Design a protein around this ligand. Structure first.
Ligand code: PRO
Ligand code: PRO
Ligand code: PRO
Ligand code: PRO
Ligand code: PRO
Ligand code: PRO
Ligand code: PRO
Ligand SMILES: [Mg+2]
Ligand SMILES: [Zn+2]
Ligand SMILES: [Zn+2]
Lengths: 343, 357
């Protein structure tokens, strides 16, 4: 009787019909696979709004113990959950042509490395022929692909010395190609890393938007890229009136020295936000979840943390939450929180 | 400065950027049309869900005094408001090709009748290709001189069976409104336009919630798919009979016999019939066997037909007031005014007088 999603044949329509049935009180949905079951209580994420080129994207959460999130647009749907400490994504596009392109895109890196246990890292899912979704275990995929080390060393810069709606204006770099499932996952992880700190949904509701910009980084250098990006925002007449919002230049790839992203440190405060100061750049590739979250952390004042399980660790470790109490207090205070308010 | 929509150049992106900014607390938006200005307080409609072929469509309302509604999908947006008692829609599609097709579609009937005030009935809005169309349906029907499409006896009493009358258990306001799907099926061979279908669905849902605080009891979820069924003739009674039979014989519809169904098309049936339904065929406790079914036109020029047929499905009879949605002749009004009809509809959705409004 309880609604279920069969991960051996999950398509866009399966995910859409289930998620579109989720009311304001949530819905129990059983995730099923061979040897797997999980009963998740799914609710609409009412804190975050997303448009990708004006396409509305809705987020859904499980309970904390469910370790499950979803993304739903008209063109694609994502189910992401943790199982035995690994993050697994089911990515399903509605259109056959786009689904085939996405499947080829994710399958391609596994062509040169046709090592054992490929299905556990990546699998094309078919109707119970062309795929209806792809399964990617990012933890297993990175072990098989043996990708070069990407990190956050010196990925920040400083300038010299009702919840509030805050727009996070993401701009697709000129000449870059980004995928909606990948961009929205970065946005969801970025928003959830903020709300997990000091009950911050009471103070802020993040509204992500994605457009294309004519700006392109003049070189592979991230510092120069960010200096040029912030300058392009100040010189854009169409951005006038939105200098107090947060901005990200996004791309699929990375910068020189495998830098995943970069941002102006401690550049956003709800009372003094101005002059496009709260800006950064971020990769959006699937294999590096949490980069936008890490850069958004720096924009909100978080410094690098000493714990290897912290989102703000200087090395890329795949963790998506702030653990540093000092960072948590800095971020929350920049969003209007004070200790007397509690969590 | 207060947000505004300039109706002299309103595009899909104008409507989408404004409506997507509407938070839980609503937003003031000034509608501007040269010297005309209306401040509307817009809020998200959280009572109704809509998918058209799995495309999510969100509804927005103004305050009661604003007389304004909006529709937003990824592909299109609609602003509909009343001006001097006339229903005016601004319809904007995102894609240039689709906007051009929609503009040509709505302009075409006016090519055989060039009126002096054609702009007051229909206008392509620019800023070389239109960004939206303005249609004043009341003025458009006067210029186009369409045949008087009516309801006549647009209902069939739902069949009954002899049975000992069981006591009705007095129920309470549910802790959560009951989700009732309104499964709309695009008739085989019919073409329907998303802005038109969603306007019929919005008017249908709003006609129910306006009665006895019914959003406490029901949250309507409209969905649209295509069916292989097509009416075997122009006759609406025979078409409805065949449609309900096609639902019962469809293995894919098994398990959803207790929901509400509409066969939708763009056109009408014989004798200018706009739609037809099984009268008093939906009750939240006894809904079954696809009984709660009807058929409806979705063309823009007949707003409220789906609302009228949904009224009959929920038990409403024809009303004597020409301003009632349930008047026996099509009059363009979108709300139930008959207290008898209101009580019948609300009782079929779980309401009782002790619950109040
Ligand atoms: O729309 C869906 O769910 C999938 C996509 C390819 C064909 N069927
Ligand atoms: O086998 C896999 O890759 C994942 C684990 C849970 C469901 N499917
Ligand atoms: O293949 C199946 O069983 C389901 C139906 C749509 C795609 N997944
Ligand atoms: O998507 C990318 O990674 C490319 C790199 C330079 C500009 N954009
Ligand atoms: O931009 C910021 O984050 C700092 C914090 C206090 C006010 N300005
Ligand atoms: O809404 C927009 O921006 C474009 C302009 C015409 C078609 N859609
Ligand atoms: O004169 C009237 O109003 C009647 C009502 C149904 C058809 N014409
Ligand atoms: Mg679309
Ligand atoms: Zn960093
Ligand atoms: Zn009638």
């Amino acid at each position: 009787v309880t609604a279920s999603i069969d991960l051996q044949s999950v398509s866009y329509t399966d995910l859409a019909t289930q998620l579109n049935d989720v009311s304001d009180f949530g819905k129990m949905i059983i995730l099923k696979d061979n040897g797997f079951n999980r009963q998740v209580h799914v609710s609409m994420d009412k804190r975050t709004k997303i448009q990708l080129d004006n396409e509305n994207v809705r987020l859904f959460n499980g309970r904390d113990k469910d370790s499950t999130n979803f993304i739903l647009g008209d063109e694609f749907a994502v189910l992401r959950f943790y199982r035995n400490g690994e993050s697994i994504s089911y990515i399903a596009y509605k259109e056959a042509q786009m689904m085939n392109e996405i499947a080829e895109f994710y399958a391609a890196p596994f062509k040169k490395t046709r090592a054992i246990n490929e299905k556990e890292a990546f699998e094309c899912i078919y109707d119970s022929k062309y795929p209806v979704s792809v399964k990617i275990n990012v933890d297993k995929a990175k072990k098989i692909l043996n990708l070069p080390e990407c990190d956050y060393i010196n990925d920040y810069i400083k300038t010299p010395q009702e919840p509030k709606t805050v727009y996070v204006i993401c701009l697709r770099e000129n000449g870059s190609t980004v995928y909606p499932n990948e961009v929205s996952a970065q946005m969801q992880d970025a928003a959830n890393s903020v709300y997990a700190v000091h009950g911050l949904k009471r103070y802020v509701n993040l509204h992500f938007v994605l457009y294309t910009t004519e700006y392109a980084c003049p070189s592979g250098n991230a510092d120069e890229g960010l200096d040029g990006f912030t300058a392009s925002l100040k010189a854009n007449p169409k951005a006038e009136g939105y200098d107090d919002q947060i901005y990200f230049l996004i791309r699929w790839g990375t910068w020189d020295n495998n830098i995943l992203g970069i941002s102006w440190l401690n550049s956003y405060n709800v009372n003094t936000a101005s002059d496009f100061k709260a800006s950064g750049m971020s990769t959006t590739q699937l294999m590096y979840p949490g980069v936008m979250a890490h850069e958004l952390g720096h924009i909100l004042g978080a410094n690098h943390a000493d714990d290897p399980k912290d989102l703000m660790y200087s090395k890329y470790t795949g963790y998506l939450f702030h653990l540093s109490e000092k960072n948590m207090d800095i971020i929350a205070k920049n969003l209007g929180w004070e200790i007397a308010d509690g969590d």
